[PDB]
Amino acid sequence: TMEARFLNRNMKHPQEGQPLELECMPFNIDNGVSWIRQDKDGKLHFIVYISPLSRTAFPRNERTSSQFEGSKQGSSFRLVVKNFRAQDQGTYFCIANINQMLYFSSGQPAFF
Amino acid sequence: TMEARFLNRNMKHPQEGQPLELECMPFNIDNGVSWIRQDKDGKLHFIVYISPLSRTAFPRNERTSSQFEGSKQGSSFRLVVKNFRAQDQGTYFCIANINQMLYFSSGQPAFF
């Protein structure tokens, strides 16, 4: 089943000012996934969609493309937060959209 | 901006055993929306995608199609829970997917 996790499964919380790598492991390859961040608010934010070919699409109002990197690394999807700051905290999820049905990963809490 | 709300804005909580109607008001028409439910868990569930033509697509493992009705009613999207039961409680959101970018509504808490 679908999970979003820290690349470093040993860490419990992200470090302020460090690069943060998350991994999404999708039940299906050759379907892309979207990374999203949920505030403690509950408020939901789209970060990036990664195609099976590692093509990325970011939101239009754009700090995002400069603060996050998306890629597919052999069967799994990756999201990198270049410098993890306070405004990046939240619960991160992977979403796959296959035949107009959505599939959600388990979330990864990322709070100092 | 995008909001999911009770059709009856006067009510604070859904009634056990009553039909529940929610409304999604999308920044864009002639794009469909997906309804999702989030547990208190944080766990996310796809309910249904409604096309701009009121065409519905439900999950494959299917209690869902029999317990929820989706439609577009003049500019807004509607989700009906036929008989609202304990297992239907959660925070409901609308999602639009336009050019591989996702847009999320504010959520509507639905708990007794």
Residue numbers in the entry:
A (entry chain A), B (entry chain A): 8 to 119
The article reads:
CD8 is expressed on the T-cell surface as dimers in two isoforms, the CD8αα homodimer and the CD8αβ heterodimer; both consist of an extracellular immunoglobulin variable (IgV) domain, a stalk region, a transmembrane domain and a cytoplasmic tail. Here, we report the high-resolution crystal structures of chicken, swine and bovine CD8α and confirm that they are capable of forming homodimers.
The CDR2 loop of chicken cCD8αα only consists of two residues and has shifted dramatically compared with other CDR2 loops of mammalian CD8αα structures. The chicken cCD8αα structure further confirmed that the dimerization of CD8α is beyond that of mammals and was retained quite well during the evolution of endotherms.
